[model samples]
Target: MEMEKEFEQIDKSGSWAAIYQDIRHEASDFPSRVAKLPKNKNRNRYRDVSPFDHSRIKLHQEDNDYINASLIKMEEAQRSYILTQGPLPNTVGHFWEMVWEQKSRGVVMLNRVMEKGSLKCAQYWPQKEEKEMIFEDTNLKLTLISEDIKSYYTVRQLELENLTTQETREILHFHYTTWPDFGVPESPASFLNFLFKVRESGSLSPEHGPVVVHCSAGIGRSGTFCLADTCLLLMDKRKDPSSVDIKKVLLEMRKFRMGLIQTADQLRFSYLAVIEGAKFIMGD
Candidate 1:
């Protein structure tokens, strides 16, 4: 298979990570400016880089200036994703504030409750069979309406309501459980399935608010997913995935959210998935 050879070749080449690192180095200063914000200075796991300000998510409430998220608005693709880090114990309400204010139709979670024996993220949503949850800081309640469980992921229909404004919206939570942090998925086929699953809901449509995509630090795994989606979309519309520069696309996305892809494997997988996905779109 041509795919096999390409995969093997990418495995052999060691430049992907180096090139990715260089992009980080070149963009390092801009992210440093983002890191200079009063609240972001110390809260971020990695302090030198933070979400770029042009598309950063800001709280609309009383007196909080810290929110670990950014709006990745891709006007040409007509897609927008709220890329953010995993919520901290104290920032949970702010997370909801983003979901509510952005009017996000879907929440794409790429990390588990814990990773590598550490608490990478919090269980921000209601647990099994638990529906209603209220965040006092944001005056919001999240109610689970339905759930569909699969081997690799879980999808839940959640409702977010602003108790003060008496306004509400339905939110879809797509949690990919088996995706290791900083690693690729089991296979591109499965990843495409998961991707289209989100697409079919139409939540990612421009008609709705942005989809919130987050992982532990909201950089590595989060970046991979966004890149894959954008490339697939370009292929669907332009009929040529290869024409789009994969590295350049990631570089552009990094302008809005720092550090998109974390590893060479993640980069290789992005290409693999794009090629395989492009074939699928062309009915291969």
Candidate 2:
């Protein structure tokens, strides 16, 4: 009950900046030794953003055990999510490998591959024209089955095959294409709509592996989505939304990864999304 009331007071008083700073101050740094290794350098999209050694998802068959991805556990929500950077060219196949090995049912992409004429992520998936792409490194083939585009997001069904074994599985790709360049979502309502759309598919249920969620750097918008989703789930179960401390919950997430919810604006947006999302879950 206190968190919602505190959020209202903070929003009305324009204290989000101060609260955001507190969150940053509250984070403790962890060692990312493998990420800093010279051989694994090119595998990471951003040198500065590294996954903690303890929590990073290690690729099973790679030359070196490294991938710029983290396994985040929210025990309270009884959920786990893999947060990762947009795949680099060399790591495209490995990205699929991580998903395959992790048994992830879906991937939630929060940013576009190209942003402002710059390449933010590798074109890892099959395009409409090609309809299929094969990864020699991982011995995997991805074929685009279908695509459904909306005003702000696109949902696609993909068929992934283990070329060696011929074992196949379907994967859901939830692409939120319209997140503004500023890193904060343009509309929380529309963002939640996309989130709920992913939820309704039953891909994020506990039976499936963690859903792989990524943005450019895999912290800002990615963290916002997980924070909002987890909080709402907790609130729905607790039936006392106020008991959930949104800030503390976020802090818990950061222990597994680094620099989640990058900017103060993103942090502010998380609170707003959680506040708005409660209405839908609680029937207010």
Candidate 3:
């Protein structure tokens, strides 16, 4: 998509930013899975930090059992993604339960355990030389088989198990550390590389469940990854600007989970990354 015209309008009048937000705000704000919760509840995170009821993932496959995760599917590209909030200390068990029950092959974590001066996300995986992290509550364990550390990201060979069944599955964790809190990556080059790495794993294939995507709130940085990756594929598919409507795709994604692309900067970064990413994937 040629964004010069849109960027110009945004540059000339900052209201374009506000107007774009208004579009998301006025979108379908229907009650979601959060509303179907037990009459009474508890939380380590804010009550409002829940996934939309409509697209939220229900663990135990029970219609009534819901988690703070939403499954977003881009059917045109046959792409599927699970967008959810960062795991709280209390929700770590539930988080792993999601990966297990959803049958997700890989996990994409976009934020560090801490950001600025505050905690951002829970360290949901096993750390250092330690073997595994067990979530007794969920009757599951995450064992680390190997670790390949890098400057920008870390990849781990992790195993998920059901203690009762003694069944286990290996999972890939692509953790991008350089990504700032509520900000875009250092550049589209690094971001695109990370995206391709995930693609090469075949985890994004529809045969598997959706790739789990999350940030602190599962909206800002998480949204950027989902939106840009989707736009890139759409652009590659059509090889024409008219084929992709970045805003429309994003707003529709927000239907599954609320407040995707949280800031104007993030929205702008989506355009930048998509434009830069097109050159690489289209020629491949």
* Candidate that scores best on TM-score: 2
Best-to-worst ranking by lDDT = 2, 3, 1
Q: lDDT tens digits, residues 120-226, model 2?
A: 99998987736689999889999999999999899999999999999999999999999887657655899999999989987789899999999989998899999
Error of 1 at 167 (Å): 1.8
* Model 1 bad stretches (over 4 Å): 1-9, 12-14, 25-28, 31-43, 128-131, 239-241
Candidate 2's displacement at residue 101, Å, is 0.6
lDDT of 3 by residue, 249-281 (tens): 887787777778777778777777887777776
TM-scores vs. true structure, each candidate: 0.89, 0.96, 0.90
Candidate 2 backbone collisions, by pair? 1-242, 1-243
lDDT value, residue 272 of candidate 2: 81
Full candidate order by TM-score, most accurate first = 2, 3, 1
Candidate of highest lDDT: 2
**Minimal lDDT window, size 10, model 2:** 179-188
